[PDB]
């Protein structure tokens, strides 16, 4: 039984501009099995107003999901994606770089 670790990307639906509505996307992909945990963190705390897409998979049979929430980015606001998966001995955090 092969396992696969999730690839994580953190970004915005539209090019971020301080003080205007946007979505904060966290795209997890390539992981197996399907059971995975994802949180969107603001300044350390986790956001509650978080949705996610429906489980699907790519041509390699690995799963992918998209978690997102509505936010107004402001200079001085830390945003990150914290995922926990079986293939990870510890939760993995990825900070939102406005240019990634």
């Amino acid at each position: 039984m092969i396992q696969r670790t999730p690839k994580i990307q953190v970004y915005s639906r539209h090019p971020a501009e301080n003080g205007k509505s946007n979505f904060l996307n966290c795209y997890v992909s390539g992981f197996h099995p399907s059971d995975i945990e994802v949180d969107l963190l603001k300044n350390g705390e986790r956001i509650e107003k978080v949705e996610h897409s429906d489980l699907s998979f790519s041509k390699d049979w690995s799963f992918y999901l998209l978690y997102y929430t509505e936010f107004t980015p402001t200079e001085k606001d830390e945003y990150a994606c914290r995922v926990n998966h079986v293939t990870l001995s510890q939760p993995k955090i990825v900070k939102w770089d406005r240019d990634m």
Binding site: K7, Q9, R13, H14, N25, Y27, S29, G30, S53, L66
Partner: peptide
């Protein structure tokens, strides 16, 4: 990086 969905 892999092609990623914008959500819309």
């Amino acid at each position: 990086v892999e092609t990623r969905p914008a959500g819309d």
